[PDB]
Amino acid sequence: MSYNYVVTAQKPTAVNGCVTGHFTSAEDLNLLIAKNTRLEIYVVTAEGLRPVKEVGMYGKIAVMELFRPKGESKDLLFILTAKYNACILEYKQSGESIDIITRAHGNVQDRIGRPSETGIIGIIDPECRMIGLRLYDGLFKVIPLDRDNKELKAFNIRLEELHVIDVKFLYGCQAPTICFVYQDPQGRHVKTYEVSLREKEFNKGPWKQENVEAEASMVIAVPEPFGGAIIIGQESITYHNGDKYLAIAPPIIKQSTIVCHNRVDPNGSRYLLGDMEGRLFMLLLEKEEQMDGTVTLKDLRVELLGETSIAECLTYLDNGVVFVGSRLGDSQLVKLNVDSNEQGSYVVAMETFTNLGPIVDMCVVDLERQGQGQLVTCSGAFKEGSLRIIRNGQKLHIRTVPLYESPRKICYQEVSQCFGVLSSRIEVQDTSGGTTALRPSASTQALSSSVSSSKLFSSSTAPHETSFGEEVEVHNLLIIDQHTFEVLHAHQFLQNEYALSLVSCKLGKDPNTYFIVGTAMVYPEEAEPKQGRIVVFQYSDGKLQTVAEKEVKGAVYSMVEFNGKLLASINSTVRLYEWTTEKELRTECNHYNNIMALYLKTKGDFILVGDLMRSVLLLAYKPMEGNFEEIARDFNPNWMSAVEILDDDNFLGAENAFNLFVCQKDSAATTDEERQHLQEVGLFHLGEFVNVFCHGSLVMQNLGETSTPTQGSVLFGTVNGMIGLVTSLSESWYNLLLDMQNRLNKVIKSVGKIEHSFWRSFHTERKTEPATGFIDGDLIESFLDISRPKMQEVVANLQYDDGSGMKREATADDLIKVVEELTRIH
Amino acid sequence: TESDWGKRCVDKFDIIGIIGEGTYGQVYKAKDKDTGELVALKKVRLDNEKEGFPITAIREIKILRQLIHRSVVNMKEIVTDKQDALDFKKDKGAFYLVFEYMDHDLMGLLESGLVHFSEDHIKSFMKQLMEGLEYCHKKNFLHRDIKCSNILLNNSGQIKLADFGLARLYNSEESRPYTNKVITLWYRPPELLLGEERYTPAIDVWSCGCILGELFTKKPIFQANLELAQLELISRLCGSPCPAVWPDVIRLPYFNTMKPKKQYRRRLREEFSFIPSAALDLLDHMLTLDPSKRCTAEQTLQSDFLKDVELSKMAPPDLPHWQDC
Amino acid sequence: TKPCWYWDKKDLAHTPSQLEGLDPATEARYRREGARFIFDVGTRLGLHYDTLATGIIYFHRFYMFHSFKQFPRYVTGACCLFLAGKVEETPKKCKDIIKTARSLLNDVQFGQFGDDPKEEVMVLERILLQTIKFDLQVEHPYQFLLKYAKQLKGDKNKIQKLVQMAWTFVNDSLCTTLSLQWEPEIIAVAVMYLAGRLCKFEIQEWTSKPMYRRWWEQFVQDVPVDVLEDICHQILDLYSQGKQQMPH
Ligand SMILES: CC[C@H](CO)Nc1nc(NCc2ccccc2)c2ncn(C(C)C)c2n1
The missing domain is CATH 1.10.472.10 (Cyclin-like)
Incomplete structure (x- = not known):
């Protein structure tokens, strides 16, 4: 068996949802921001936000909504986790003591159901009579909000429309009414139903179905003065309410897909819209009052306000202040002005909240020679693309390098006092027949620049037609100085050439240090790329010179230096190349038992190969023979997102289901079968998506640092900006820490009353397993924050094993010292 | 000639790697040196000398040389390790069963969650599987181990049935005792939970229906670790075993012993309301508690859901692209 | 194949x-x-x-x-x-x-x-x-003896006597190289033919074609009497060489 420890170095920073209400007091205006597994509660002031409370939940927050049922003084909070844990929460404050009350809770998972394409949707009735959940295709789940439903018991209503895009509860209806957009073979439609808690079924809805735009994406529930709903698409915005129908199709919105909506005026006069290019719009409802006294909707208007970060959630707060919650870039507070500035913008940024964005790749480098190590991360996407340099100093110091294009891979080349970074920028087919970039970015603002002239694929004769307005990716290698972080050089790759892998190394007997890039030729028609280039570049005297190129019959997804040789993965094949005295690559040996060789890692003459669905494989290079041998494979099928080698026997992997596992050589030489079987000995539900595993530590090493119980150091970056650390433990230390977790879980109160053991259980949709071989360090590190009575309660009857003293009782002060040493690893 | 098996050497194959570990030996992917065709070679070791050649392999050799069907895997030949010269007693070399290589296994495709099955894909899948099962059932052979891992698929959309290590002949006229529990618990029919021991070909139908539901939910329908817990899960959806729905349930040894918590009513149509009507009817018939009332393979093939499916269009399943990477 | x-x-x-x-x-x-x-x-x-x-x-x-x-x-x-x-x-x-x-x-x-x-x-x-x-x-004469006998209709006792005698002839032919000379289907017919001769039964009448004198053909196509006699000769030789006599 294997024993490991996992802790969070940086909490998730990307904003996954945000809502406003009166949650902490019936008087205060609250902003609740949701990061993965984390809830932040703020109070809105005239200058900005005042933080009041933050809690973690043992689950990914999927639904977050504030409602106030009749009889309550203040808003209650509904949260549903991605594993279908539901709960209703209340804020309670007693002077200086702030705690979160779990008013109702339960798990709403169905034994049989198909998870929907557009994900979990949760909505609440305007009269707070019920919570609507769309969890499975063809089913609508209703949790009625009666006082007695403390377990959140619920029933399903059969739904004829299997493929639902979005749903909202409407305002101004005689009964609880849902309005939704759905897709069937005939296009997209908008339809209504009434929900009857008495009959536990749908009844005919208030207004008839209407055929809507093919890419109708979002449903906006308009308030009582107007009633009805607004449907947001790619080209048009329509208003529907019985007989009334309006449609505005302003050309400006066609340019970028609109992704988020919020209400500015409680009456529904003004709504805010945002799109993936960061543009922020105001949607205006132009009223017309008849002599009857009735208020109708006259027209819709769309007005461009300015630019914000690419935003997952928008919430207007008060006055001219809007909170911009961003998942791909830094989140923001911006002020909307009535008068435009001299550039034509009504939006002026107030504060910037750091978001490590998606961490696509990262490396640890000791820039200042300090024995510490700093983390340079490829963070963000598109306009929010950034390099983030992170050092420890008690908070983490983060520097941001704006790139305004997507960073893909990073590698450090010390000989050149610089970094190599792969990046891609979006251009659009313009009227010239070529393409034009939406905004200048790192690859265009390089001091010196170069464009590849390779004729390897020039024979073409394969037609790829271009329509004006279509997007294309343009990939570059950026040379970036390690002190100024100024773009020194940018090499634009070939048309339709994607840069997938990057290494900096010496090869063979060649004293020169090269940047080597593995590419793929990507055409929309190809399911799998069938062409590729391995390019060798030397950065010298401010100019990058192509030393050699190797044509391959696929995509070079991953490359890694292997004892003076170049190990590259081309589609199914894993290949080892030798660097000749003629400065050309030569195939040496190949391994082909892979569906898709996405990830590669080396230790000695051993290679760890990561497959899309074939989990992980342990290869070995056999020098006596000049070829590869398969040592052992993990037969259990898992989808891989990143792998890493912990030691000569243990191997770490990350699943696309937000799970971590550790495989080991079965170390029993009895039969050939046992050795060739990698046994999974660690299972852990991380809750984050791991892209990059990287050996290194951010902690300052003065050489005086006490040798911690933990041995080894693997950092990892995730999509939500979370940075974590994996390390190994001795059998004794693990058993001690594991026994303590079980003790801590009985003592510590979970928000939503979510069992910790469930949260960390390995979870694929098809299989669920209890965690094994992993210590939730974040649970262990919470021992220091529980009150003294609880600390002593935890240590009762706690014994140590196999130490200086075989059995040794623990006191609350002994464990406080142990955990405090464990907090020093990050 | 092509028919003189057991003599050709495994030298004739370049071994690529280990695809999976079989129960009686490990299975390796290989390329034929002469033709280039990819084949999967199953390792048969008699060195154990406990009972000599595995009967599980003997069943696969006996049955698969008899069964010819597009939806049934073809054993191409049997080859051997370099045998010891003129000393058979010293020789402990192993034999290999050559099979056509298949690109993917169903269990792997579902587990990655990358594959997406449309109704038409499922139709093409189910039609092939049932056509293979009907061929086998018509030849009076029972598979006895229908699992997602044993369903093999080529990217073309061709489906083939695989492990026959537990297959045995069924005699309708003569009921004879068999192995009490054959199919994996997740796909085991209620009769085997209750220990009929004289099971009918309907055991395979139950499993295939479990697969039908699995293709729609992307999640196994009934997954448990204990035989009673599975009976409860089956009972919740298909209804509790009771004399009205299963007149002969009282004769099954474990009817009184193994009981569900309640006498649950059948809810299959409700819980699978999202499944298309043509298919839902197929499921209700395949997942019928009473083996005598459970539909046959031919009946599943003569189906509104499957009868009008044309095998010319095999509907290739959704392939993960570079973008999916 | x-x-x-x-x-x-x-x-x-x-x-x-x-x-x-x-x-x-x-x-x-x-x-x-x-x-x-x-x-x-x-x-x-x-x-x-x-x-x-x-x-x-x-x-x-x-x-x-x-x-x-x-x-x-x-x-x-x-x-x-x-x-x-x-x-x-x-x-x-x-x-x-x-x-x-x-x-x-x-x-x-x-x-x-x-x-x-x-x-x-x-x-x-x-x-x-x-x-x-x-x-x-491997297929054996036994299954064909029964598949063919089931299609005979007539005196229940005369047919059962035919079957048992033929069944005995099958068991005895296992001591010979007939298993290596003729498919089992032919063996099953040959033993029916032999038992018919010995019991003085005319099997043609029990068949669905009472007038098809060559009853073997409706079971096994392309079998000359030459073959059925060669098989009979070989079976009875075992009895003549040994002390044992035809079962009758
Ligand atoms: C995956 C389990 C499956 C069980 O028979 N094994 C398997 N799986 C096959 N599919 C390919 C595969 C490769 C690697 C992992 C999983 C599946 C396969 N192809 C031909 N054969 C022969 C032995 C009948 C195959 N056998």
């Missing part, structure tokens, strides 16, 4: 056993003894008639590729029966076959099994499988 398991009578002059100097009579005696050993061992173990026959067919086929002087018959017979049990799903443990073989064989005979009987048998399994070319499925 599939191997040819049938030879011409003339070819039996050139079995390995013949060419190593064994005379025709001795190989015939060796075959009867080996077949009867397989039959007797498995009958003592309670084995189905198909299992006994399958072992005997393996045995006969084996000595078309090997010599009796290099492979002891009783070891081979025991190995065949052992494998036959696994093929026909009537399995037996090798130790139990040895136990029974020891009970029925004298001391000289059991000397073939050598110092370790189980090992000599289990080791032979490799050769047997390679020799029979892994063509394990």
Whole structure:
């Protein structure tokens, strides 16, 4: 068996949802921001936000909504986790003591159901009579909000429309009414139903179905003065309410897909819209009052306000202040002005909240020679693309390098006092027949620049037609100085050439240090790329010179230096190349038992190969023979997102289901079968998506640092900006820490009353397993924050094993010292 | 000639790697040196000398040389390790069963969650599987181990049935005792939970229906670790075993012993309301508690859901692209 | 695809056993003894008639590729029966076959099994499988005797007498090389033909074509009487050579 420890170095920073209400007091205006597994509660002031409370939940927050049922003084909070844990929460404050009350809770998972394409949707009735959940295709789940439903018991209503895009509860209806957009073979439609808690079924809805735009994406529930709903698409915005129908199709919105909506005026006069290019719009409802006294909707208007970060959630707060919650870039507070500035913008940024964005790749480098190590991360996407340099100093110091294009891979080349970074920028087919970039970015603002002239694929004769307005990716290698972080050089790759892998190394007997890039030729028609280039570049005297190129019959997804040789993965094949005295690559040996060789890692003459669905494989290079041998494979099928080698026997992997596992050589030489079987000995539900595993530590090493119980150091970056650390433990230390977790879980109160053991259980949709071989360090590190009575309660009857003293009782002060040493690893 | 098996050497194959570990030996992917065709070679070791050649392999050799069907895997030949010269007693070399290589296994495709099955894909899948099962059932052979891992698929959309290590002949006229529990618990029919021991070909139908539901939910329908817990899960959806729905349930040894918590009513149509009507009817018939009332393979093939499916269009399943990477 | 398991009578002059100097009579005696050993061992173990026959067919086929002087018959017979049990799903443990073989064989005979009987048998399994070319499925005259008899309608007792007599002839033909000369379907007809002659029954009448004098043709196409007589001649020879007489 294997024993490991996992802790969070940086909490998730990307904003996954945000809502406003009166949650902490019936008087205060609250902003609740949701990061993965984390809830932040703020109070809105005239200058900005005042933080009041933050809690973690043992689950990914999927639904977050504030409602106030009749009889309550203040808003209650509904949260549903991605594993279908539901709960209703209340804020309670007693002077200086702030705690979160779990008013109702339960798990709403169905034994049989198909998870929907557009994900979990949760909505609440305007009269707070019920919570609507769309969890499975063809089913609508209703949790009625009666006082007695403390377990959140619920029933399903059969739904004829299997493929639902979005749903909202409407305002101004005689009964609880849902309005939704759905897709069937005939296009997209908008339809209504009434929900009857008495009959536990749908009844005919208030207004008839209407055929809507093919890419109708979002449903906006308009308030009582107007009633009805607004449907947001790619080209048009329509208003529907019985007989009334309006449609505005302003050309400006066609340019970028609109992704988020919020209400500015409680009456529904003004709504805010945002799109993936960061543009922020105001949607205006132009009223017309008849002599009857009735208020109708006259027209819709769309007005461009300015630019914000690419935003997952928008919430207007008060006055001219809007909170911009961003998942791909830094989140923001911006002020909307009535008068435009001299550039034509009504939006002026107030504060910037750091978001490590998606961490696509990262490396640890000791820039200042300090024995510490700093983390340079490829963070963000598109306009929010950034390099983030992170050092420890008690908070983490983060520097941001704006790139305004997507960073893909990073590698450090010390000989050149610089970094190599792969990046891609979006251009659009313009009227010239070529393409034009939406905004200048790192690859265009390089001091010196170069464009590849390779004729390897020039024979073409394969037609790829271009329509004006279509997007294309343009990939570059950026040379970036390690002190100024100024773009020194940018090499634009070939048309339709994607840069997938990057290494900096010496090869063979060649004293020169090269940047080597593995590419793929990507055409929309190809399911799998069938062409590729391995390019060798030397950065010298401010100019990058192509030393050699190797044509391959696929995509070079991953490359890694292997004892003076170049190990590259081309589609199914894993290949080892030798660097000749003629400065050309030569195939040496190949391994082909892979569906898709996405990830590669080396230790000695051993290679760890990561497959899309074939989990992980342990290869070995056999020098006596000049070829590869398969040592052992993990037969259990898992989808891989990143792998890493912990030691000569243990191997770490990350699943696309937000799970971590550790495989080991079965170390029993009895039969050939046992050795060739990698046994999974660690299972852990991380809750984050791991892209990059990287050996290194951010902690300052003065050489005086006490040798911690933990041995080894693997950092990892995730999509939500979370940075974590994996390390190994001795059998004794693990058993001690594991026994303590079980003790801590009985003592510590979970928000939503979510069992910790469930949260960390390995979870694929098809299989669920209890965690094994992993210590939730974040649970262990919470021992220091529980009150003294609880600390002593935890240590009762706690014994140590196999130490200086075989059995040794623990006191609350002994464990406080142990955990405090464990907090020093990050 | 092509028919003189057991003599050709495994030298004739370049071994690529280990695809999976079989129960009686490990299975390796290989390329034929002469033709280039990819084949999967199953390792048969008699060195154990406990009972000599595995009967599980003997069943696969006996049955698969008899069964010819597009939806049934073809054993191409049997080859051997370099045998010891003129000393058979010293020789402990192993034999290999050559099979056509298949690109993917169903269990792997579902587990990655990358594959997406449309109704038409499922139709093409189910039609092939049932056509293979009907061929086998018509030849009076029972598979006895229908699992997602044993369903093999080529990217073309061709489906083939695989492990026959537990297959045995069924005699309708003569009921004879068999192995009490054959199919994996997740796909085991209620009769085997209750220990009929004289099971009918309907055991395979139950499993295939479990697969039908699995293709729609992307999640196994009934997954448990204990035989009673599975009976409860089956009972919740298909209804509790009771004399009205299963007149002969009282004769099954474990009817009184193994009981569900309640006498649950059948809810299959409700819980699978999202499944298309043509298919839902197929499921209700395949997942019928009473083996005598459970539909046959031919009946599943003569189906509104499957009868009008044309095998010319095999509907290739959704392939993960570079973008999916 | 599939191997040819049938030879011409003339070819039996050139079995390995013949060419190593064994005379025709001795190989015939060796075959009867080996077949009867397989039959007797498995009958003592309670084995189905198909299992006994399958072992005997393996045995006969084996000595078309090997010599009796290099492979002891009783070891081979025991190995065949052992494998036959696994093929026909009537399995037996090798130790139990040895136990029974020891009970029925004298001391000289059991000397073939050598110092370790189980090992000599289990080791032979490799050769047997390679020799029979892994063509394990075998059909036997029994099933055809019944498939064909079921289509006869008439005096219940006259037909049952025909079947049992023919069934006896099937059991006796297992001691001969007929299993190597003619498909089982032909054997089943031949024994019906023989029993019909001996009981003075005219099977044509019991068939759905009472006027089709050649009743064998509605069961087995393309069989001349020449063949059915050759088979009958070979079966009755065993009775004339031995003290035993036709069952009647
Ligand atoms: C994956 C389990 C499956 C069970 O028979 N094994 C398997 N799986 C096969 N599929 C390919 C595969 C490769 C690697 C992992 C999983 C599946 C396959 N192809 C041909 N064969 C022969 C032995 C019948 C195959 N056998």
